[PDB]
């Protein structure tokens, strides 16, 4: 009965929310352990890291490949293909499978590097791997914000595959035929945490 | 026909097609104007109209200081309800608001905006209860994802139902509610021809 009562702080990143595993993780756990009071905090991967260090978070969903990652339990959760979101009318939705080289001279909308550090450097690298430096467009607040801006035919973007559940009119998500760098997702917690509540949560994702 | 025009809009309106459609269309007709988009909530939108940083805004009418501007109504969409897919309420064809009295509501003023947030609260009260507000702490944009996680139920503009997050469903509200309104606003007496091309493109 250890740890079936108390309070757990769960953090996750803005676009990781859209990945179906965070809502599932949370929903499963709130079933087994109704009595435990959750506390959800959505934030930057470095925010989630700092807060796990601080004691202000107990478990986080976050994108591995951050500096100092060799300080926590990092358990690989999810790997997802990255897809290009354009406007429906765009010339290139006509091509079946999209090569990123066809978007050299486009304006690439993106989140700020501080706003999404891990996703960004891999987004640029695919363009680079595709043989051009992307022209950065208008900075937008959240991953969903850029999708509506694509609907307004303002740019193309690259999003995790789980954003293709934002079915705004007038955008489409296509698949790149290059490296298709993925979006990794990892369950991260504190090394040495003997909380039972934490493992009640950590085994929920890993039964 | 030349210059820059500064356009602004609420995060939530960008799901209502009128905003992409009116931008996409103007961008076609007038490629020489450099569009500048500022996504922000209505109160700062008006602020930017006043201090001069914004020349038109898509926003929610009936705010205070709304007589210092021009506002022409653009759309009105009903507000629906998002709930987790294995909710008891999923199974009713038409749902009421009464049936959520003891329920947990997930409103975040940041995502939806004051004017919408308070009216949804008002709406519950008209049903016959004070809605028990879910998470005050660390407000995060996008409730649908906490609704997929069975943490509550939220009320969102009909536009938002294009967010087909797995594990949520959306249903219409049989209780007569207030709807989600959107105006289009510019300063009184702005005498730009570039500004007028934006308004005419929205209201042709």
Author numbering:
A (entry chain C): 86 to 292
B (entry chain D): 89 to 292
What does the paper say about this structure?
The bacterial protein ItcR is unique in its ability to bind to itaconate. Structurally, ItcR is a transcriptional regulator protein with an N-terminal DNA-binding helix-turn-helix motif and a C-terminal itaconate-binding domain (IBD)24. Multiangle light scattering (MALS) analysis showed that IBD appears as homodimer in solution. Here, we report the development of a highly responsive, genetically encoded itaconate fluorescent biosensor, referred to as BioITA (biosensor for itaconate).
Furthermore, the crystal structure of IBD without or with itaconate binding was determined by multiple-wavelength anomalous diffraction and refined at a resolution of 3.25 and 1.48 Å, respectively. In line with the result of MALS, the IBD proteins form a homodimer in both of the apo and itaconate bound states. Notably, alignment between the structures of IBD in the apo and itaconate bound states demonstrated that monomer in each dimer exhibited translocation of over 7 and 10 Å in the N- and C-termini, respectively.
